[PDB]
Amino acid sequence: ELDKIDLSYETTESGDTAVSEDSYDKYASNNTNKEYVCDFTDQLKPTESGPKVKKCEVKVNEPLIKVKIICPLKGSVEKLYDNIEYVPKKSPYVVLTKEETKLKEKLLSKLIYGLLISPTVNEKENNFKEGVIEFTLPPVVHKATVFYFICDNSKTEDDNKKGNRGIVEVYVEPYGNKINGCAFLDKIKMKTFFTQNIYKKNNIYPCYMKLYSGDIGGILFPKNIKSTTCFEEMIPYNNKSLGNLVNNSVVYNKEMNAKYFNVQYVHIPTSYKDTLNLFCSIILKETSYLVYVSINE
């Protein structure tokens, strides 16, 4: 349901606005730390000059960037957004890619392996129905990607004024090679993204992700998983969560609720220079797997 694509859907960047591509009002996202934001609250109001096309360019060449997109909701202000529309309606699970000057629906998870889509944004649903959508990009991207969202207010009319059509284009350039960590496996995508693979039937080497200051770690957890003490209750062999052990580290997908990819990532800060040797575990339902994390050995 949330991930349902319509293969027959077609649109264009300009939509039905009659604006040629040379006349788009292009601008960049408001980038702060690792959060790139395209806010349309003030951009799409009905204007005399409208309909104008306003394109927000999200250019990503770094890992673990979070993209927030704010699209004003119908009725947030009376009359000004009465006929607003957003595309795809199943964003961010569904995005638009350019195929022959045409935009068609594609699953974002198949475009970028490892992409984290949380179910909630600020404890509201992660859907344009709540006005905001978010997704975190992975620590590794191999092929360049370009996908689009639409937040179109051009059909809204107020006296002689008309709203504007909003376009967000996310441009991901390649970055990274492999993720320091382990993939518990049963595609080639699962095998090539992590430095160590752990097979279920006959394993010799348990999970050993070796981190240093500035490095990114990750774990692809087994599909069948009961619980894990990994990154919240860790055992030093030299304040038990990794956050408490490494001040200002960040763990992505703490709650393991992201769709598709059962992964969480860790970022060791460049400041952190002390040495640490930790243990956590992964429980299956059916045995359990041991995880050894070393930092700055």
């Binding site: 591509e21 040379d22 292009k26 360019e57 250019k59 370009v146």
Partner: peptide
């Protein structure tokens, strides 16, 4: 214009 393209070495970069 500076538009992005998946063609390598190319940019949608006509000047106006």
């Amino acid at each position: 214009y500076g538009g992005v393209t998946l063609v390598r070495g190319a940019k949608i970069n006509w000047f106006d």
